[PDB]
C-alpha cells in the first residue's frame, strides 16, 4: 500500500513535492530540500552548555583586558584592543548567536543538540586544519572583517531556492535556517582563533568547501521521493521480529488504516 | 496538530524496535495522509478515490470496479502517472525522464 | 508556453537523472556511428568517448525541463555545471 | 517491434478517453456478422464458416487472410465483430447504476425530479465533480416518490409554480437477481421493469439531464449502460489451442458467446413464431444472463453458470482481477528476456561491485552491439569465434531485418561485417548488469555490477554487499537482468551501480559494511597485543592491489 | 525469469526512467498497432503494403497513427472494449495543464 | 503528412464535411481565416495564374543561388518558346528531376499566363484588390479572359450580387488593357 | 485557385546525418517527402518557398535509438482543384468517351454527353476529335472546362467538368 | 458572534444565512474555555489578502485545486472565520530547518 500511495510523488524542477496532479504535498523536499543521503548527526554547541560557558566561549569584547582576543592569536591583536568600531561588528555576532540560542531552545525543547543536516563542518574543517600544517604556535592572520565578513557572505551563496521575487527568495532564508545557526556556530571569531588556528588561506578555503559541498547536499529534480519515502518505512518494518500498549507492526497496520477502534487508547495529561 | 500527532505516533512505532529513518520520509508520508483536507488512509477507501486518473488507481484492490465507472462517467486520463505510462510502454516522467534533450543545431556548429 | 534565458529559475547545475542520461544518449548516438567532437585519445567505448565529449564540454545536446505547469526552461550542456 | 515498416506517424499516448460503446459504432466498428454459432467445419471440411470467429476476424491456421490486412497471425491485431440481440440487456457491472438512475428520475416523461426550484438541490449542482455531484443528487431524490407538477417558488409558499407535467408516482426499486423490480403505493403494486422500457426513459432523459447526472453527451450517455449490439472479441483475445489437426482446443470465452449466440437465436425465433406471451421471459432471462455472465461470473446472484465438469468459467473481469491477471500481472509486472537464476555464494576475492557469471550463463546471455570501425575488428573475431568458445557471439544482424544464426548458416565463419549492422554477442567482462534478490523492496534489492565471468555454476557476489540485497549462502537464489541499450546501461553504471548504493538515504548512513571473518578477523589482527614480523608484512602489502611499494 | 510489481517499483526508486521501459517493453511484450486519429481504438485496418489504411465507422484513410505498446495491454484494451468498455488512445492533449 | 497550422480538436463524430463549390465555401483548411507560423491570422492566398508562375520562379531562381553559396566548399528578351528552355534548366538544377508534376505546372502555369512583368502583375493586384471581393474570386478573375460581365459573373457565380455589372466591367476593361502582349 | 498555405512536417533523422550540415540533409529531405505529393486536405504540394528561412526549431531525441525529430515549419505553393470552379487547359487524349482537358498538375475529364449536341465525335480522324458546325477540338486545342465533380486518388486528383454551359467551349 | 451554552434550537440556527452580505457564528462555552491555539501541537497560522494569495498561486504557478486544503469546520479555522476560498500560511518549527512555511487554502 505505502508504496501504491505514494508513487506519483517526486521532486519537481521548481523544488517543490507534488503528485500526479500537481498537488503540492511538500512546498520544499523534508522542509528542507537536502537529499538525505548528503546528512550526518553533527551537534549544535551554541544550544547545551550553562549561560556561563557561553560567554567564556563566544564572547568578545575589544573594550577591556580580559576579554579581548589575546594578541597571541590574531597578527593584529595589539592594534584592536579598544577600537570602537570593531566592537560593533563583534557585538551585532554576539546579539546573534545570542538569539540562534534561543531560536533553538525554542525549537528543540528536550535540550538534543545531536541533529543531522547537510555539509559536515567537524570534518571541512579537521581537513583544512593537516591540510596547510596550521601551527598552534604562532598567529593568525584574519582581519576581524575578514571573518565576521566572509561568514556572513557565505550564508548569501547557501541557496537552495533561487527565484526572482520575495515569496520565493523568503521561503529560502527559512529552509536555511537551522544551517546557519550550527553555521554561525562553528564560525565564530573566538572559535574560528583559540580553537582551530585558521590562516586566512584555510578560512577562504573552508568557506569555499562548505558552500559547494552545501550545494551538492541539495536534492535534484528527479528523485521519485515518493516511492523512496515509502520503502524507507516499510522495508524496516519487515525487519521488526517480535511497557504495555499496542506496539509494531500490528499497530502500524492500525495507524495506516486510520482505525477508530484502537485496543490501546491511552492519553497521558501533564 | 493531527499531523504532529500522526507522525509522532508513527515515529514511534519505528523508534520502538531501535531502528531509525530520516523526518523527511514518515514526513512525506504523513503528509500525504493529510493534506487532502483531514485524515486521509493509506487504503482502498481512501488514496484510491482520489483524483488520480483511472489507470493508476486500476492497479491496485478494485481493477475493473474501478475501470467500469470510467467509461461510465466518461474519465479523462493524462497519462502523467507512473503506472499509466508504465503499462503503455512508455517512459514515464521519473528521474531519468524529468526533462527532454536536444540538438541545439547553433552549438552543433562551433564544435569543429 | 516556454520560457526566456533570463528569468531563468532551475538549478543552475545538472542533476544527477540528466547528466546520467545525456551520457547514455549520447553514447547510444555515437555508438550508431554519429559524429564525435573531441579527438578520441584512443578511445573506443561509446559511454566512454561520451564521458569525454561530456567534459570538454562538447556536447551539442540542450535540456528542456518542464515544469509542473507545463512550462519549461532550457539549458545547455554546456552552461549546466558539472560537480557531482 | 512487430517488424515491417509503415508510412504511418509514430507517437506517444498521451490521453485516455473511457468511453462506454454505442450500439451504433459498434455496428460501424466491426466487421462480421457472427450469426451462426458453431465454429468451424463447413460441414466437417476444415477451415471457418462466415459464423463465429472469422466471417473475416482475425484468423488461425498460419494463413495470411484478416480481411486481405494479410501479414498474418502476428501482426494482425484482432478485428472485432458484433452480434445484434434479440431484445435489450443489462450490463452485469452497470447494473448499480442503471438502477440508482431511476431512482434518481421518472419514467413516462423521463426527467429531474429536483429542479433549481428545490433549493437543497441548487448546493448540490454546483458541486464541481461527477463523482460526487452524482452521489449527491441521488441522495436527495431517492426519497422523493411523486414526480411534482407544481412547487413553491422563491417567494410565497402561498403560490405554486409550474413545470414539467405528469405526476404518475415513483416507485421505490429494488435488486432481485438480474432483474429490477419496484412497487407503487392501499396496498401494493410489484411488477417487472422490462429492460426494453428502461432503455426508454433513458433514451428520452435530457441533455443537460445526462450532464447533470455524472455522464457525458459524447462518450457515455445512459441509455447505453444497456446493451443492443454485443461487440465479439477476436480470435487473439480468445485464441485455441491445437493439438496438431484433427482435434479441438477451443478457448473458454469462444463458449460463452456460442451460449449467448444460442440464447439469442432461441429467443428471436419465439417472437416470430408461436410465441406464448409470457413462455418467453423465461428465455430472456437466459440471454440477460449469459450476456452478463460473460462479463462476470463472482455475483451473489449464487450461480456460477458452472461449464460442464463442474469448471468456473473465466469471466472476461476475472482475468483483470487483481494479481496473476493483465493488469497487475501482466502490464505493472512481466516474464522478460535476458534474464538468468541460480544460486549464490560468497567469494571474498571479488571487488566490491563486481559480480560472478558463470560461464554457462555468459555463453547463452547476449549483448547486442552496433558495429562500428572502433569495433569491427574485435566483433568479427567473436562472430568468427563462434557461439561455443567463450568470448564470442551468436547472432548477426544486417540492415534488411534478417537473423544470422551463428550456429548454423553455412556462412558461419565467413561473414564480412558492415558499419551498422549488430552482433548479438556474449556478455563480457565488465558489462554492466543489474543484479537482484527478492523480495525486493529497497533502492537496494536491485543494484548493478560488474560482470566477471568464471568457471562452476553460481552467481558469486562479494561479501559486503550481501545485507543489501539481505541474503545468505544456505541455497538462496538470485536474479541478473542484462540492459540493452547503450544508453540503458547508461543508466545502470550512473545510477544503479553498487558503488553509489553505499550511502543509504533511507537512514542518511552507509548500508554496506564488514561481517564475519574480515570483521572478526580485523579486530584480531589490530590489538596492541597483536604483532607482525617481516615474511608475512611483505606479504599483506602485496595484496593490497594499490600499495605504492613503500615496506 | 520475472520483473514484476516490486522489482519496478525499485527502477522507479532509483529513477532509472530508460531500463525500466526496457524490461518492459523491447525485452519483453512489444507490439506495434495503429490508431485512429478520430475514435482512439484500434480498429484500423493497416495494410502495410498498399499503404492502404481506413477505419470505416470513424471512416478515415488520413489521420492515423502507429504507437508501440505493451501487447498485454492491446490485450488490456481489447478485453475491455469486449465488456462494452471504450479505451481512447489519443496523441495529442487538448486538455491542457 | 504534412500538418496545417490549426488542431481542429476531434472529439470522435467527423461528420459534416461540407460541400466543395463555388459558393466559396472550401475545405475546413480553406476558410478566409487562416494561421500563419508566427502565430498570426491572415487572409488567405489567392494566385492567378501567372502570379504563380512568378512565384514559382521567384523561388526556384533564389533557389539555384543559396544552392551555391555551399557549392564553393521591366523586360527580358521576348524568352518564349524562349521560357520554356529557360525554365526547364532551373528545374533540371533546383527540382526533384521526378517532380514531373512541377514540369507540368510550368508548362501550362507559362503557357496560359497573361503577365510577365512583375510590375505588370503588381498593378493587377493593386487593382482588384480595392474590390472587398474574396481571394478566390480576385484570382478567378486575373487568369480569366472576360470581356462581358456575363461572361465574368457567370464563370465566377460568387460574384452576382457582390458588384455592380458596370463597375466589374471597368475591371474587365484595364484588364485587357494592362494584359501584356506576346 | 492556385494556394500558397502554410505547412509544416516531421522528419526522423539518423544519428548517422548528425554531422555539421545537417540543416542542409534536413531540407534536403523535406524537399523530397513534399515537391510532387498529393492530399485531399491540401492538394497538389508543386513548390517550396523562400528554401532559405525555412524554420527548423530544435529537434528532440526519440528514446530508444538516437534518431531525432524536428518539426520543419515550411510554405509553399498549392492547388487543389474544386467542384465548380472554371479552368482552362490543353486537351490530351480523346476518345469516343469524350476528351480529357489538363488543367496543370491535373486531368480534367468531359464526357461526350456532358459536351453539347451539335457537336460529334470523328473517330476516322487522325489525329482523334470532335467535330462542329463551327468548332474543332482535338489534340492541341485549348479548351475551358467548369469543374462539376473532384475525386481524390493515391498520387493525384482526377475529375469531371463540362463544356455545356455558355462561355465555355474552345477559345 | 454568538455564544450559546448548554445549546441552540435548530428552528432558530437556520436563520444566520438569510441576511448577506453580514456574516454570523456560533460558539458553544465550553469549547472556548481553553484556547486551542495556545497547545503545543497546533502551530500558528495567518489570514491570507486576497491579494497575497493571488500572489501565492503565481509564484508557485498552481491552481486553486493543487492546493493543501484546511476543513471549514476545522478548529483553527472557526478560531480565525475563514471562508471558502481564504487561504492560510502556516507557520511551524522543524527539525530539519528550523522554521517551514506551508499553506492551507479552504473548503
Ligand atoms: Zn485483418
Ligand atoms: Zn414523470
Not at chain 4, 537473423?403 to 564480412?416: F, W
Not at chain 4, 545485507?467 to 549462502?473: E, G, H, I, T, V
Not at chain 5, 472494449?81 to 492533449?93: F, G, K, Q, S, V
Not at chain 7, 465548380?84 to 475529364?109: A, I, L, R, W, Y
Amino acid at each position: 500500500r505505502l508504496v501504491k500511495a505514494l508513487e506519483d510523488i517526486m521532486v519537481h524542477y521548481d523544488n517543490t513535492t507534488r503528485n500526479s496532479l500537481g498537488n503540492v504535498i511538500q512546498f520544499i523536499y523534508g522542509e528542507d530540500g537536502m537529499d538525505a543521503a548528503h546528512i550526518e548527526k553533527q551537534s549544535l554547541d551554541t544550544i547545551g552548555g550553562s549561560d556561563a560557558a557561553f560567554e567564556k566561549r563566544y564572547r568578545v569584547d575589544l573594550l577591556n583586558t580580559d576579554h579581548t582576543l589575546d594578541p597571541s592569536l590574531l597578527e593584529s591583536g595589539s592594534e584592536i584592543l579598544g577600537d570602537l568600531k570593531l566592537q560593533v561588528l563583534l557585538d551585532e555576532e554576539y546579539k546573534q548567536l545570542v538569539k540562534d540560542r534561543k531560536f533553538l531552545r525554542e525549537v528543540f525543547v528536550d535540550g538534543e543538540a545531536n541533529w543531522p543536516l547537510p555539509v559536515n563542518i567537524r570534518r571541512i574543517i579537521q581537513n583544512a586544519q593537516q591540510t596547510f600544517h596550521i601551527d598552534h604556535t604562532k598567529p593568525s592572520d584574519l582581519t576581524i572583517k575578514d571573518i565576521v565578513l566572509g561568514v556572513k557572505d557565505l550564508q548569501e551563496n547557501l541557496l537552495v531556492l533561487r527565484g526572482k521575487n520575495e515569496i520565493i527568495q523568503n521561503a529560502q532564508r527559512d529552509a536555511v535556517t537551522l544551517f546557519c545557526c550550527l553555521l554561525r556556530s562553528r564560525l565564530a571569531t573566538r572559535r574560528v582563533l583559540q580553537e582551530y588556528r585558521l590562516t586566512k588561506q584555510a578560512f577562504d578555503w573552508v568557506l569555499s568547501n562548505i558552500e559547494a559541498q552545501f550545494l551538492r547536499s541539495v536534492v535534484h529534480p528527479g528523485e521519485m521521493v515518493g516511492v523512496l519515502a515509502a520503502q524507507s518505512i516499510g522495508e524496516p518494518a519487515t525487519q521488526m521480529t517480535l511497557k504495555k500498549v499496542t506496539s509494531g507492526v500490528p499497530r502500524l497496520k492500525e495507524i495506516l488504516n486510520v482505525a477508530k477502534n484502537m485496543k490501546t487508547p491511552s492519553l497521558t495529561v501533564y | 496538530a493531527g499531523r504532529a500527532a500522526l507522525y509522532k505516533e508513527v515515529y514511534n512505532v519505528i523508534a520502538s524496535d531501535g531502528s531509525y529513518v530520516n523526518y523527511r520520509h514518515m514526513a512525506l508520508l504523513v503528509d500525504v495522509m493529510t493534506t487532502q483536507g483531514g485524515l486521509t488512509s493509506v487504503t482502498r477507501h481512501g488514496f484510491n478515490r482520489s483524483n488520480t486518473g483511472a489507470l493508476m488507481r486500476c492497479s491496485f484492490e478494485e481493477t475493473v470496479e474501478i475501470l467500469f465507472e470510467a467509461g461510465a462517467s466518461a474519465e479523462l486520463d493524462d497519462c502523467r502517472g507512473v503506472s499509466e505510462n508504465v503499462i503503455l510502454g512508455q517512459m514515464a516522467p521519473i528521474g531519468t525522464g524529468a526533462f527532454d534533450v536536444m540538438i541545439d543545431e547553433e552549438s552543433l556548429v562551433k564544435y569543429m | 508556453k516556454a520560457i526566456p534565458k533570463d528569468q531563468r529559475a532551475t538549478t543552475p547545475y545538472m542533476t544527477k537523472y540528466e547528466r546520467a542520461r545525456i551520457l547514455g544518449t549520447r553514447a547510444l548516438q555515437i555508438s550508431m556511428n554519429a559524429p564525435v567532437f573531441v579527438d578520441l585519445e584512443g578511445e573506443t567505448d561509446p559511454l566512454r568517448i561520451a564521458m569525454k565529449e561530456l567534459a570538454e564540454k562538447k556536447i551539442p545536446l540542450v535540456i528542456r525541463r518542464y515544469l509542473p505547469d507545463g512550462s519549461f526552461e532550457d539549458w545547455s550542456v554546456e552552461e549546466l555545471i558539472v560537480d557531482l | 517491434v512487430g517488424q515491417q515498416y509503415s508510412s504511418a506517424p509514430l507517437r506517444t499516448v498521451k490521453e485516455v478517453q473511457f468511453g462506454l460503446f454505442s450500439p451504433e459504432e459498434v455496428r460501424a466498428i466491426s466487421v462480421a456478422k457472427i450469426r451462426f454459432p458453431e465454429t468451424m467445419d463447413e460441414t466437417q471440411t476444415r477451415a471457418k464458416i462466415g459464423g463465429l470467429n472469422d466471417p473475416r476476424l482475425g484468423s488461425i491456421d498460419r494463413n495470411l487472410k484478416c480481411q486481405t490486412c494479410q501479414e498474418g497471425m502476428n501482426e494482425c491485431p484482432g478485428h472485432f465483430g458484433h452480434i445484434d440481440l434479440a431484445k435489450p440487456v443489462f450490463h452485469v457491472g452497470f447494473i448499480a447504476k442503471i438502477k440508482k438512475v431511476c431512482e434518481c428520475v421518472c419514467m413516462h416523461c423521463g426527467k429531474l425530479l429536483l429542479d433549481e426550484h428545490n433549493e437543497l438541490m441548487r448546493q448540490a449542482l454546483a458541486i464541481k465533480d461527477s463523482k460526487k455531484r452524482f452521489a449527491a443528487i441521488w441522495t436527495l431524490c431517492k426519497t422523493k416518490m411523486v414526480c411534482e407538477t407544481d412547487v413553491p417558488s422563491e417567494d410565497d409558499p402561498t403560490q405554486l409554480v409550474s413545470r414539467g407535467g405528469c405526476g404518475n408516482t415513483q416507485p421505490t426499486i429494488r435488486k432481485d437477481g438480474l432483474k429490477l423490480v419496484g412497487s407503487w403505493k392501499d396496498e401494493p403494486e410489484l411488477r417487472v421493469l422490462s429492460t426494453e422500457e428502461i432503455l426508454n426513459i433513458f433514451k428520452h432523459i435530457s441533455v443537460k439531464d445526462f450532464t447533470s447526472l455524472g455522464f457525458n453527451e459524447v462518450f457515455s450517455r445512459p441509455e447505453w449502460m444497456i446493451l443492443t449490439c454485443l461487440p465479439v472479441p477476436p480470435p487473439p483475445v480468445r485464441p485455441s489451442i491445437s493439438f496438431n489437426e484433427s482435434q479441438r482446443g477451443e478457448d473458454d470465452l469462444t463458449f460463452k458467446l456460442a451460449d449467448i449466440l444460442k440464447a439469442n437465436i432461441s429467443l428471436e425465433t419465439l417472437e416470430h413464431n408461436g410465441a406464448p406471451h409470457h413462455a418467453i421471459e423465461e428465455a430472456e432471462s437466459l440471454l440477460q444472463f449469459h450476456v452478463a455472465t460473460y462479463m462476470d461470473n463472482d455475483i451473489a446472484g449464487q450461480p456460477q453458470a458452472l461449464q460442464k465438469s463442474g469448471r468456473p468459467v473465466k469471466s472476461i473481469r476475472a482475468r483483470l482481477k487483481g494479481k496473476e491477471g493483465r493488469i497487475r500481472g501482466n502490464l505493472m509486472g512481466k516474464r522478460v528476456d535476458f534474464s538468468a537464476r541460480t544460486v549464490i555464494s560468497g567469494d571474498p576475492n571479488l571487488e566490491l561491485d563486481q559480480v560472478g557469471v558463470p560461464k554457462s550463463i555468459a555463453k547463452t546471455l547476449t549483448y547486442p552491439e552496433v558495429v562500428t570501425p572502433y569495433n569491427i575488428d574485435r566483433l568479427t573475431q567473436l562472430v568468427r569465434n563462434g557461439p561455443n568458445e567463450h568470448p564470442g557471439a551468436k547472432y548477426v544482424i544486417r540492415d534488411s531485418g534478417d537473423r544470422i544464426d551463428l550456429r548454423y548458416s553455412k556462412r558461419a565463419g565467413d561473414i564480412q561485417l558492415q558499419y551498422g549492422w549488430k552482433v548479438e554477442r556474449h556478455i563480457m567482462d565488465n558489462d554492466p548488469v543489474l543484479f537482484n534478490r527478492q523480495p525486493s523492496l529497497h533502492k537496494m534489492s536491485m543494484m548493478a555490477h560488474r560482470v566477471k565471468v568464471i568457471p562452476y555454476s553460481t552467481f558469486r557476489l562479494n561479501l559486503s554487499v550481501t545485507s543489501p540485497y539481505n541474503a545468505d549462502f544456505d541455497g538462496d537464489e538470485m536474479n541478473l537482468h542484462v540492459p540493452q541499450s547503450e544508453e540503458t546501461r547508461a543508466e545502470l553504471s550512473q545510477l544503479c551501480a553498487v558503488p553509489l548504493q553505499i550511502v543509504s538515504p533511507q537512514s542518511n548512513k552507509p548500508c554496506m559494511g564488514i561481517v564475519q571473518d574480515t570483521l572478526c578477523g580485523i579486530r584480531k589482527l589490530t590489538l596492541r597485543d597483536t604483532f607482525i614480523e617481516l615474511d608475512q608484512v611483505l606479504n599483506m602489502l602485496y595484496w593490497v592491489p594499490d600499495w605504492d611499494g613503500v615496506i | 525469469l520475472r520483473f514484476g510489481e516490486m522489482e519496478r517499483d525499485c527502477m522507479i526508486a532509483h529513477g532509472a526512467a530508460s531500463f525500466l521501459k526496457e524490461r518492459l517493453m523491447e525485452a519483453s511484450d512489444a507490439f506495434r498497432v495503429h490508431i485512429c486519429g478520430i475514435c482512439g481504438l484500434m480498429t484500423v485496418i493497416a495494410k502495410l503494403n498498399h499503404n492502404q489504411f481506413e477505419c470505416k465507422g470513424c471512416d478515415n484513410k488520413i489521420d492515423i497513427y502507429q504507437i508501440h505498446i505493451p501487447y498485454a495491454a492491446k490485450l488490456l484494451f481489447q478485453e475491455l472494449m469486449a465488456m462494452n468498455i471504450t479505451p481512447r488512445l489519443y496523441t495529442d492533449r487538448s486538455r491542457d495543464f | 503528412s504534412t500538418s496545417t497550422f490549426q488542431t481542429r480538436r476531434r472529439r470522435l463524430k467527423k461528420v459534416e464535411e461540407e460541400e466543395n463549390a463555388a459558393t466559396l465555401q472550401l475545405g475546413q483548411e480553406f476558410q478566409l481565416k487562416q494561421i500563419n507560423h508566427q502565430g498570426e491570422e491572415e487572409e488567405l492566398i489567392a494566385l492567378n495564374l501567372s502570379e504563380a508562375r512568378l512565384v514559382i520562379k521567384e523561388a526556384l531562381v533564389e533557389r539555384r543561388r543559396a544552392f551555391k553559396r555551399s557549392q564553393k566548399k521591366f523586360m527580358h528578351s521576348e524568352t518564349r518558346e524562349k521560357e520554356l528552355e529557360s525554365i526547364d534548366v532551373l528545374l533540371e538544377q533546383t527540382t526533384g528531376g521526378n517532380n514531373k508534376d512541377l514540369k507540368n505546372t510550368m508548362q501550362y502555369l507559362t503557357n496560359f499566363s497573361r503577365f510577365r512583368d512583375q510590375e505588370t502583375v503588381g498593378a493587377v493586384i493593386q487593382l482588384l484588390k480595392s474590390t472587398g471581393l474574396h481571394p478566390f474570386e480576385v484570382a478567378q478573375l486575373g487568369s480569366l479572359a472576360c470581356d462581358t460581365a456575363d461572361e465574368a459573373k457567370t464563370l465566377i457565380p460568387s460574384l452576382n450580387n457582390k458588384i455592380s455589372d458596370d463597375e466589374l466591367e471597368r475591371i474587365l476593361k484595364e484588364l485587357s488593357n494592362l494584359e501584356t502582349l506576346y | 485557385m492556385f494556394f500558397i498555405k502554410d505547412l509544416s512536417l516531421n522528419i526522423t533523422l539518423h544519428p548517422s546525418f548528425f554531422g555539421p550540415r545537417m540543416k542542409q540533409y534536413l531540407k534536403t529531405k523535406l524537399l523530397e517527402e513534399v515537391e510532387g505529393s498529393c492530399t485531399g486536405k491540401f492538394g497538389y504540394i508543386l513548390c517550396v518557398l523562400d528554401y532559405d528561412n525555412i524554420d527548423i526549431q530544435r529537434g528532440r531525441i526519440l528514446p530508444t535509438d538516437g534518431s531525432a525529430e524536428f518539426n520543419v515549419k515550411y510554405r509553399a505553393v498549392v492547388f487543389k482543384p474544386f467542384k465548380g470552379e472554371v479552368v482552362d487547359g490543353t486537351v490530351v487524349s480523346c476518345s469516343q468517351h469524350g476528351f480529357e482537358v489538363q488543367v496543370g498538375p491535373m486531368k480534367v475529364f468531359v464526357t461526350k454527353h456532358l459536351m453539347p449536341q451539335d457537336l460529334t465525335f470523328n473517330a476516322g480522324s487522325n489525329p482523334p476529335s470532335y467535330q462542329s458546325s463551327e468548332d474543332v477540338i482535338t489534340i492541341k486545342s485549348r479548351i475551358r472546362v467548369k469543374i462539376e465533380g473532384c475525386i481524390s486518388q493515391v498520387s493525384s486528383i482526377h475529375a469531371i467538368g463540362s463544356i455545356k454551359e455558355d462561355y465555355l467551349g474552345a477559345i | 458572534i454568538f455564544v450559546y451554552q448548554n445549546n441552540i434550537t435548530p428552528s432558530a440556527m437556520k436563520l444566520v444565512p438569510s441576511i448577506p452580505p453580514a456574516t454570523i457564528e456560533t460558539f458553544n462555552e465550553a469549547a472556548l474555555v481553553v484556547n486551542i491555539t495556545h497547545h503545543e501541537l497546533v502551530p500558528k497560522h495567518i489570514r491570507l489578502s486576497s491579494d497575497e494569495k493571488r500572489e501565492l498561486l503565481k509564484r508557485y504557478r498552481l491552481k486553486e485545486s493543487q492546493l493543501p486544503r484546511i476543513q471549514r469546520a476545522d478548529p483553527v479555522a472557526l478560531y480565525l472565520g475563514l471562508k471558502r476560498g481564504e487561504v492560510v500560511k502556516i507557520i511551524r518549527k522543524s527539525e530539519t530547518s528550523g522554521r517551514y512555511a506551508s499553506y492551507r487554502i479552504c473548503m
